[PDB]
Design an enzyme around this catalytic site. Structure first.
Site, PDB file in Angstrom:
ATOM      1  CG  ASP A  66      -1.624   1.374   1.362  1.00  0.00           C
ATOM      2  OD1 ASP A  66      -2.271   1.816   0.392  1.00  0.00           O
ATOM      3  OD2 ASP A  66      -1.518   1.996   2.435  1.00  0.00           O
ATOM      4  CB  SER A  67      -0.187   4.758  -0.719  1.00  0.00           C
ATOM      5  OG  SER A  67      -1.061   5.016   0.372  1.00  0.00           O
TER       6      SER A  67
ATOM      7  CB  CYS B  39      -3.055   1.261  -2.584  1.00  0.00           C
ATOM      8  SG  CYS B  39      -3.064   3.013  -2.963  1.00  0.00           S
TER       9      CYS B  39
ATOM     10  CD  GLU C 270      -2.245   9.849   5.750  1.00  0.00           C
ATOM     11  OE1 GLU C 270      -1.632  10.895   5.430  1.00  0.00           O
ATOM     12  OE2 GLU C 270      -1.954   8.716   5.293  1.00  0.00           O
TER      13      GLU C 270
ATOM     14  CB  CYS D   5     -10.089   6.042  -0.130  1.00  0.00           C
ATOM     15  SG  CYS D   5      -8.608   6.633   0.752  1.00  0.00           S
TER      16      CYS D   5
ATOM     17  CG  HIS E  32      -6.640   6.886   4.534  1.00  0.00           C
ATOM     18  ND1 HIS E  32      -5.875   6.138   3.668  1.00  0.00           N
ATOM     19  CD2 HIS E  32      -5.773   7.645   5.244  1.00  0.00           C
ATOM     20  CE1 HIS E  32      -4.600   6.433   3.845  1.00  0.00           C
ATOM     21  NE2 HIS E  32      -4.510   7.345   4.795  1.00  0.00           N
TER      22      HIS E  32
HETATM   23  N1  LIG Z   1      -4.198   4.160   0.156  1.00  0.00           N
HETATM   24  C1  LIG Z   1      -4.768   5.225  -0.688  1.00  0.00           C
HETATM   25  C2  LIG Z   1      -4.981   6.485   0.157  1.00  0.00           C
HETATM   26  C3  LIG Z   1      -3.638   6.990   0.713  1.00  0.00           C
HETATM   27  C4  LIG Z   1      -2.862   7.732  -0.347  1.00  0.00           C
HETATM   28  O1  LIG Z   1      -3.314   8.758  -0.837  1.00  0.00           O
HETATM   29  O2  LIG Z   1      -1.778   7.308  -0.710  1.00  0.00           O
HETATM   30  C5  LIG Z   1      -6.094   4.784  -1.293  1.00  0.00           C
HETATM   31  O3  LIG Z   1      -6.771   3.837  -0.767  1.00  0.00           O
HETATM   32  O4  LIG Z   1      -6.538   5.360  -2.339  1.00  0.00           O
END
Ligand SMILES: N[C@H](CCC(=O)O)C(=O)O
Ligand SMILES: N[C@@H](CCC(=O)O)C(=O)O
Lengths: 267, 267
Positions: free
Chosen positions: B10-11, B73, B152, B184, B186
């Site tokens: 993931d990011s 992600c 975050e 997303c 998050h």
């Molecule tokens: N993990 C990214 C969100 C976090 C990011 O912007 O890198 C998503 O689900 O799109």
């Protein structure tokens, strides 16, 4: 390739519990069903014979160029599935695990029951599947050879049926089960009678109905879904028995007036 | 193979919602998480750069012998899933389709909404997935860039978060949709607030949860599920940014104590 149909095999009308759910969840998918009503019932037949008959139904559908094969039969699945999945280029789907994972997710007792044909019960598949997921769960299996004939004979609504299901299911009584897996794709046509016998405290799991859900993700996984339009060619229904008695119960359970069916030969 | 871990890339820390979901649905599965926290967010980044990074994460995890790759992600998935899925010898899963599938299944008025990062929304990935399943559905896509920072910074409970969420989601308010996909990683932490803003007529789809349910079916399909039986090792957490700060967000979400993470270099 992607516009090719999905094939569903079974020993008779049991496969229709899965097909019905496929019509509802996968409206744009073309289906080709095959019920070996002539050799039915499987559940007692020797495993090796079942593996044979199943392969025969497979080859019959392969010639019709299916893109996916659904063994909508617990008996066949229990003995055939691994072998046919490993041998075919297209994906093959069984009905045991979907039912097993659904039961595990719904039980609150950790006391699960499963009814099915002799073959399914003897293979201990459902036991074996549930053990690998949640070993703390107590599984109680029971073979019900009398059930399948009640369905094929189109008498699953009769008082007779009610008395048989009742006496046969008394063996699971007083064992504290809060979940019962319909381990036979024929049993969902007896669902109201079974639910009545077991009680409102028991949740019934339709193994084949759960399978369509897996079918859905597999289409995306293997990216072989049919275009989002109702197919041109209608759904094909084949049976090795009285093409007429098939239509009788098929059209009723599916809710399809003038359901066509064509008898055929295998082996 | 069956004893090897599942990989999740993931990011940054977002993917932890997917990993947490896997800890719940797949308790016997060993997991290995990789988060490019040193380079997140991915949302505002151009696709190409995202495709490059995702590939680096994938590579690194492959060298660690994972049996299945999960791109936790949405931003990453929306542009690199196809390639990586096709190139790797192990099963590769993304978080877009499982969510689109679920949404399509639940909508009753053919109006699905989707929210995520600019990147995700900009790729039209969801509109594409949904219309290729059901053309009749009106898909409304909205980018909500404030949601990530809000999560975050651990400010997703604040009354403030509610005003902002209410303001951002005002657009979707006049569409008449009954289904909204949380596109997303998050967003699951904002689900309660998002639910109240969208009201009781709206069903929220948790792409993370839907994706883990697929991995579960895929484990059974390829028959590579880790034994229930014994024995397992520690999950492994890797990041391209500070491991200390990561170990904080990790225990602060996964709840787990003393979660040790290692910093690494990709490319
Ligand atoms: N993990 C990214 C969100 C976090 C990011 O912007 O890198 C998503 O689900 O799109
Ligand atoms: N379709 C039944 C098979 C019944 C039989 O052929 O005996 C099953 O789910 O196993």
């Amino acid at each position: 390739s992607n516009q090719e149909a999905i094939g569903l095999i079974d020993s008779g009308v049991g496969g229709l519990t899965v097909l019905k759910e496929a019509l509802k969840q996968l409206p744009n998918e073309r289906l080709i069903y095959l019920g070996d009503t002539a050799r039915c019932p499987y559940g007692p037949r020797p495993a090796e014979q079942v593996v044979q008959f199943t392969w025969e139904m497979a080859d019959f559908l392969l010639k019709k160029r299916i893109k996916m094969l659904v063994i909508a039969c617990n008996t066949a699945t229990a003995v055939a599935l691994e072998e046919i999945k490993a041998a075919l280029p297209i994906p093959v789907v069984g009905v045991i695990l979907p039912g097993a994972r659904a039961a595990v997710k719904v039980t609150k007792n950790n006391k699960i029951g499963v009814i099915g044909t002799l073959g399914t019960i003897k293979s201990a598949s459902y036991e074996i599947a549930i053990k690998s997921k949640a070993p703390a769960i107590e599984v109680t299996s029971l073979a019900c050879p009398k059930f399948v004939p009640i369905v094929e004979s189109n008498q699953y609504r009769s008082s007779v049926a009610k008395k048989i299901v009742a006496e046969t299911l008394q063996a699971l009584q007083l064992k504290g089960l809060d979940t019962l897996i319909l381990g036979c794709t024929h049993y969902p046509l007896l669902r109201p009678v079974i639910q009545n016998v077991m009680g409102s405290h028991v949740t019934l799991i339709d193994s084949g109905a759960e399978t369509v859900g897996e079918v859905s993700m597999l289409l995306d996984y293997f990216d072989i879904a049919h275009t989002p339009e109702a197919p041109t060619q209608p759904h094909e229904f084949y049976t090795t028995g009285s093409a007429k008695m098939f239509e009788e119960i098929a059209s009723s359970w599916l809710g399809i007036e003038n359901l066509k069916a064509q008898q055929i030969h295998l082996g």
